[PDB]
Design a protein around this nucleic acid. Structure first.
Ligand SMILES: [Mg+2]
Ligand SMILES: [Mg+2]
Lengths: 1206, 115, 114
RNA sequence: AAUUUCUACUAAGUGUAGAUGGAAA
């Protein structure tokens, strides 16, 4: 038994097969004459209308119920907030009071004032008819009587609104975290400046116009927050601040405008108020998108005004509190250090040096775990003041002034773009083409939106997330401008989704056929209520739907052997036995079935469930009650073949229900005379759609799809319970999205060219027409049948532990290792239990194998063509969604090449871990697509299955492996999942695999002191004359940050040549370069150790160039970026034999024993880490295996990589 | 008068454009995809004789599939790759890269692009 | 007052006939030898709208090999077989099989002829 | 450049090779 054969039948897993339904015979004319489409097309076209109406009613209900709320904890929250908490374990009760507050706002929501007749079927049936005064708006909601089940998802999303899950889509979180915050903030901002606005200029007016009762003070006074929860409440609050309209063109001036004009003092800088938040593009026509663009970005719209306000606000960066403006720590510091200082990692390094001088001792070297903790403490830091960022720089270089310069530069960029786009903003513009094909119009939209958006993404860093004293005089204006500028995201995401949108459309609606419960399940007894069956003739499976008024039209049909007989699929499965049997037997039917009191009293206690140790007789007493009642209840005794097990097998109650559910599946075949059903079709009494997809058609010979195999096995005889037909099918209709004036067709008998350059046959002469998107130019019914694979699973156990136990006890476990690369989209190498490489290759050429011949579709030259295509397209918006839809239709043909090795080797898989890695920007498969790969390789291993295998054998479609848990979320990809070990990827590609060397120095030039200390930190610099090499004997103890290594005594050499990047490229030879460098300065390099000789030259031109060659010696990763044919990794250190590792000595081998490219090295060293983890599993005891760590830290990894090769 | 001839010679120009596109579409339909010339595309007829190459609203890309319409048989082309859905009715092969268009390629060169 | 207008019509109709012969040279090049249509070859540009079939000069034979000229790109045609050494520059397909021309076969029917 | 749908195709001629969980917001 291989390691895999144990993993099947583990857990339940439901999928949704789809198909095309072809109306057969005279059913199309009947659907057209009875008009069963324009009705169901009118419904799912106005359903958005009833969504609008239900939103209106929910808002009216919320505003009618929040005029009775009372936040009693408010009088204490208001004082608890302004305590200067200084938590000291006292803010936890603050959190608790806040939670109880948001809950006591949802008590009336969840409990009273309705909320029952709100989300059930009642609201569209009876409640909403009252809540209306129009006939139009009543006709819609009256037409949905009975079709409430077409909402349940909407009602689902509308329960997120009444709960307090601490999410943006809730009411309580809105009126607690984003109102009370701003409420108290503005209240204190007023308390500061209360006596500024004198009476006779603001008060006498804001009294008479707004309310003239509890006029202006009460809204700031006390607990009147119990009034600013409605919409009229927040409207009157912004009327206090922003002002009124007085129903004419007066526009009296508001509090914020009064603080604005109170700049008469010209030294005001006063903190302005903030409003309250309140709860509740195009993509239709080219003219609409152009109008929305002009209305949302022209020089009058609010976005350009906000750009002007930000230009002004950052032009005055001097007159603000330089200790109150906070850049946000995170990704933005990486670039802020490049703009402000001049290097990529200045801020992080200054902060690391400071943290060294605080927390670290004066140890002669750092410790790996200490450096990790320092990185962690940095990551925890929230924000940085401009003052600190001033401290990290030297003198004669401000930080506020440099930021002012940078922001002004970006704003001048935006202005220049707006100047190069004036042609589009004229009101009298017109188009010569459609926007999707027009590019000198989309290139301008993109050049403008990219400018505005890369300004908005560089400004956002000035927020810093919740702080100490800040500069309110800055943040008032900043937030007021930025919250407006933020709408460019909506615009840029709703114009790109219109210039990218394909020409056709998959917009469908649902067919009900005048029946709410249509097709909701396949049961024999309920046919006359669901009206849907699945006939089968020969090898073709027909749907069958009766009508509205002839529900009894498929019963009186006998076999009668007329040489035509539709089969018919029946014998309903069993619905939820764990609740069904208690429901189907305790539904008050004890009147005239049995006589006993012993069973009835243990029912009264209900002592047959858990909540006790265990019992042998009480549990099986109820088990036998159910058993000897079903074996006499005729509705189930005749239907199912209830062959239960013996009495000693039961050990719990769940076993009984699992057995009852496993036994209640008997999809059976009845017969029916073909002429009678055909006449039923012709009489207009039965609509017979044929299920279809290109693997059912007679002219197809190759391998069928996967889902076709599942749908055929749904009705096999060797499918006992593994793939069963979970009820709930659906039938949708898709209108034609292409005008028949727009089909394009490769005409008949005209030789066509073949797009695949690796294909031998370079033409094709088909004797018919090959339309383009023929499927989108015709009305197409589609059918959605859900199935439930492995419904009743037997082998229940945890997988993360069983894989570990199976690896420990195994002697030779293979390990596949998958890593991206620069010249290879995905390199694979599979290494056995010792460390040998048993197979290694690249996934660039996917070799498709059919009918005994194999043709290799490349996927790198193809992606290279699409990149060269994107390079010269002038709009890059549909030409960069094509690459994103190729790279995700490539990692669906890699998934097969991985689920082939996982079965050929019984291996585990070793994937890179994406939460803790920075791949260097030239690797082809970027991270956003990799995460889509690791999520597509989990969803496949959930039910791994081989199409070309006997459907019963282990591995085939009925008993497929389940070697991974379901996919939870992208952040739960760490340290284990089934057979998929997630291993970090540090020191993985730049590490020579013959020895285990790695380059831990720092060989960039800084000065002459550092350089002389460097050349003095070695042990030997000697020209061996017999080998013509410059032996550098180094000991890693002298240098810094080299606490990771293990051997710590290396003999570097100068063997081989290197490829300096210079983007130029220059092939240098190391020994010759050193000879030339030493001759250029007169250094007699034949005196063994020339260490002291090397520390004599005193210019800056020597140590600036010696460090260069010393760096080129420790490279091991030479690339040219021009040829995939010459890239290679070479090591400067001899191995146990004496020869260097030169990856060009293995490219010319059929199956080498070491990595060939420099990308096979990446995946080889990603698989070795998992071999080390397997090593760890062979230590602990089977009770501790669930606790062994897998995250192999750099010290452990270098040790394992330097001890294995001897 | 003399302003009707100049409303009829602009109908000889179009019967020349159609002939040129039909001559091309049978000389592009044969080259294997990695050799198709760089073209200047447009949805309004492009005279390959003069073409005023200096106009800034015509780019130069490759030409992908050359299909043929359904109702009539007007030979639509496909700039770049198909999945861009950039279907253009009239092309003319040039010898320039993306935007620095050098000169209009003559049909003899497009023919000798296959060898 | 008709100095050059005739020289405009004589160019428009010739360009139309050339487009027709270029649309037909393919539909001929993609057929089996035994399914070619019956041509009325004349080596002078012929029209497909009328063709004046009453003239006793237009013949009726199956077309031979359709060869693309090498000096210019003209689609020349052969008639019968290469043993007749007949070479023409303009043809039109008709369903007048032998010598009596009932009708001129339209393009969609010389395509469908396969 | 055909498809339940996506990607790559033409794959021996109305198709080939992998993948595919839909509905909903
Ligand atoms: Mg297939
Ligand atoms: Mg395609």
């Amino acid at each position: 038994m291989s390691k895999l054969e144990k993993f099947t039948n583990c857990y339940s897993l439901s999928k949704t097969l789809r198909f095309k339904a072809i109306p057969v015979g005279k059913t199309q004319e009947n659907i057209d004459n009875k008009r069963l489409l324009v009705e169901d097309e009118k419904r799912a076209e106005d359903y958005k209308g009833v969504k609008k109406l239900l939103d209106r009613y929910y808002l009216s209900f919320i505003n009618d119920v929040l005029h009775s709320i009372k936040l009693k904890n408010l009088n204490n929250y208001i004082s608890l907030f302004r305590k200067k908490t200084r938590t000291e374990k006292e803010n936890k009760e603050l959190e608790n009071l806040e939670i109880n507050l948001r809950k006591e706002i949802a008590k009336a929501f969840k409990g009273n004032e309705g909320y029952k007749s709100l989300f059930k079927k009642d609201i569209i049936e009876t409640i909403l008819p009252e809540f209306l005064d129009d006939k139009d708006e009543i006709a819609l909601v009256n037409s949905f009587n009975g079709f409430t089940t077409a909402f349940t998802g909407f009602f689902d999303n509308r329960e997120n609104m009444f709960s307090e899950e601490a999410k943006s889509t809730s009411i309580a979180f809105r009126c607690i975290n984003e109102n009370l915050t701003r409420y108290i903030s503005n209240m204190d901002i007023f308390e500061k400046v209360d006596a500024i606005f004198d009476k006779h200029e603001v008060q006498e007016i804001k009294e008479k116009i707004l309310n003239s009762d509890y006029d202006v003070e009460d809204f700031f006074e006390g607990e009147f927050f119990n009034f600013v929860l409605t919409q009229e409440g927040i409207d009157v609050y912004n009327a206090i601040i922003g002002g009124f309209v007085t129903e004419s063109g007066e526009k009296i001036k508001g509090l914020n405008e009064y603080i604005n004009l109170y700049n008469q003092k010209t030294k005001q800088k006063l903190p302005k108020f903030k409003p309250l938040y309140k709860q509740v593009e195009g993509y239709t026509s080219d003219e609409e998108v152009l109008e929305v663009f002009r209305n949302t970005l022209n020089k009058n719209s609010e976005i350009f005004s906000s750009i002007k306000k930000l230009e002004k606000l950052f032009k005055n960066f001097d007159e603000y509190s330089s200790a109150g403006i906070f850049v946000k720590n995170g990704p933005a510091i990486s670039t802020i250090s490049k703009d402000i200082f001049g290097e990529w990692n200045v801020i992080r390094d200054k902060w690391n040096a400071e943290y060294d001088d605080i927390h670290l001792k004066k140890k002669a070297v750092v410790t790996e775990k200490y450096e990790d903790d320092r990185r962690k403490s940095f990551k925890k830091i929230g924000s940085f003041s401009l003052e600190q960022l001033q401290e990290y720089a030297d003198a004669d270089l401000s930080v506020v002034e440099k930021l002012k310069e940078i922001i002004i530069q970006k704003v001048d960029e935006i202005y220049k773009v707006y100047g190069s786009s004036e042609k589009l903003f004229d009101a009298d513009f017109v188009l010569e083409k459609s926007l999707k094909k027009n590019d000198a119009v989309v290139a301008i939209m993109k050049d403008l939106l990219d400018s505005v958006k890369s300004f908005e993404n560089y400004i956002k860093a000035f927020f810093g997330e919740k702080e100490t004293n800040r500069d309110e005089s800055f943040y008032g204006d900043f937030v007021l401008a930025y919250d407006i500028l933020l709408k460019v995201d909506h615009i840029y995401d709703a114009i790109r989704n219109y210039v990218t949108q394909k020409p056709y459309s998959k917009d469908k609606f649902k067919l009900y056929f005048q029946n709410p419960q249509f097709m909701g399940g396949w049961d024999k007894d309920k046919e006359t209520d669901y009206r849907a069956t699945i006939l089968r003739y020969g090898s073709k499976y027909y749907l069958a739907i009766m009508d509205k008024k002839y529900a009894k039209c498929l019963q009186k049909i006998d076999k009668d052997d007329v040489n035509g007989n539709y089969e018919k699929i029946n014998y309903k499965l069993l619905p939820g036995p764990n609740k069904m049997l208690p429901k189907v037997f305790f539904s008050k039917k004890w009147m005239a079935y049995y006589n006993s009191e012993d069973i009835q009293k243990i029912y009264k206690n209900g002592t047959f469930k858990k909540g006790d140790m265990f019992n042998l007789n009480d549990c099986h007493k109820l088990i036998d009650f159910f058993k000897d009642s079903i074996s006499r209840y005729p509705k189930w005794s005749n239907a199912y073949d209830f062959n239960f097990s013996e009495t000693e097998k039961y050990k719990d109650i769940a076993g009984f229900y699992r057995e009852v559910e496993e036994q209640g599946y008997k999809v059976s075949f009845e017969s029916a005379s073909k002429k009678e059903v055909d006449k039923l079709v012709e009489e207009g009494k039965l609509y017979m759609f044929q299920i279809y997809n290109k693997d059912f058609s007679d002219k197809s010979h190759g391998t069928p799809n996967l889902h076709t195999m599942y749908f055929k096995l749904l009705f096999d005889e060797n499918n006992h319970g593994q793939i069963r037909l979970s009820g709930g099918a659906e039938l949708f209709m898709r209108r034609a999205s292409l005008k028949k004036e727009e089909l394009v067709v490769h005409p008949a008998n005209s030789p066509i060219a073949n797009k695949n350059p690796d294909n031998p046959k370079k033409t094709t002469t088909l004797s018919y027409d090959v339309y383009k998107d023929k499927r989108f130019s015709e009305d197409q019914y589609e059918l959605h049948i859900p199935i439930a694979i492995n419904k009743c699973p037997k082998n229940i156990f945890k997988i993360n532990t069983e894989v570990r136990v199976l690896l420990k006890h195994d002697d030779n476990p293979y390990v596949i290792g998958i890593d991206r690369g620069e010249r290879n989209l995905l390199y694979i190498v599979v290494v056995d239990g010792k460390g040998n490489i048993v197979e290694q290759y690249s996934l660039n050429e996917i070799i498709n194998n059919f009918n005994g011949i194999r043709i290799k579709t490349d996927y790198h030259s193809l992606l290279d063509k699409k990149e060269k295509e994107r390079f010269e397209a002038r709009q890059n918006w549909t030409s960069i969604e094509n690459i994103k839809e190729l790279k995700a239709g490539y990692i669906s043909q890699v998934v097969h090449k991985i689920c082939e090795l996982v079965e050929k080797y019984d291996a585990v898989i070793a994937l890179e871990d994406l939460n803790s890695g920075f791949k260097n920007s030239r690797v082809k498969v970027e991270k956003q697509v990799y995460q889509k790969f690791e999520k597509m390789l989990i969803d496949k291993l959930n039910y791994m299955v081989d199409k070309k295998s006997n459907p019963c054998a282990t591995g085939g479609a009925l008993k497929g492996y389940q070697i991974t848990n379901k996919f939870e979320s992208f952040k739960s990809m760490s340290t284990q999942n089934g057979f998929i070990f997630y291993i970090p990827a540090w020191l993985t590609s730049k590490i020579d695999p013959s020895t285990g060397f790695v380059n831990l120095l720092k060989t960039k030039y800084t000065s002459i002191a550092d350089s002389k200390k460097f050349i003095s930190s070695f042990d030997r610099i000697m020209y061996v004359p017999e080998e013509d090499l410059f032996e550098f004997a180094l000991d890693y103890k002298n240098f810094s940050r080299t606490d990771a290594d293990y051997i710590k005594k290396w003999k570097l050499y100068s063997y081989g040549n290197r490829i300096r990047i210079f983007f130029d490229w220059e092939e240098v030879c190391l020994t010759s370069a050193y000879k030339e460098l030493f001759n250029k300065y007169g250094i007699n390099y034949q005196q063994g150790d020339i260490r002291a000789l090397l520390c004599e030259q005193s210019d800056k031109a020597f140590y600036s160039s010696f460090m260069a060659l010393m760096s080129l010696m420790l490279q091991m990763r030479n690339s040219i970026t021009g040829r995939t044919d010459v890239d290679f990794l070479i090591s400067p250190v001899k191995n146990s034999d004496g020869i260097f590792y030169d990856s060009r000595n293995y490219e010319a081998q059929e199956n080498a024993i070491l990595p060939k490219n420099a990308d096979a090295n990446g995946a080889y060293n990603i698989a070795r880490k998992v071999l080390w983890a397997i090593g760890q599993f062979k230590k602990a005891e089977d009770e501790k295996l669930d606790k062994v760590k897998i995250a192999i830290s750099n010290k452990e990894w270098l040790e394992y990589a330097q001890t294995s090769v001897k | 008068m003399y302003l009707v001839v100049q409303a009829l010679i602009r109908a000889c120009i179009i019967k020349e454009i159609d002939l040129y596109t039909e001559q091309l579409y049978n000389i592009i339909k044969s080259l294997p995809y990695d050799k198709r010339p760089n073209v200047v595309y447009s949805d309004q007829p492009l005279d390959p004789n003069n073409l005023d190459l200096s106009e800034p609203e015509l780019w130069a890309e490759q030409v992908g599939e050359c299909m043929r319409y359904a109702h009539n048989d007007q030979p639509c082309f496909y700039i770049g790759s198909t999945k861009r859905e950039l279907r253009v009715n009239y092309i003319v092969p040039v010898i320039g890269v993306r935007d620095e268009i050098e000169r209009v390629m003559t049909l003899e060169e497009v023919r000798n692009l296959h060898k």
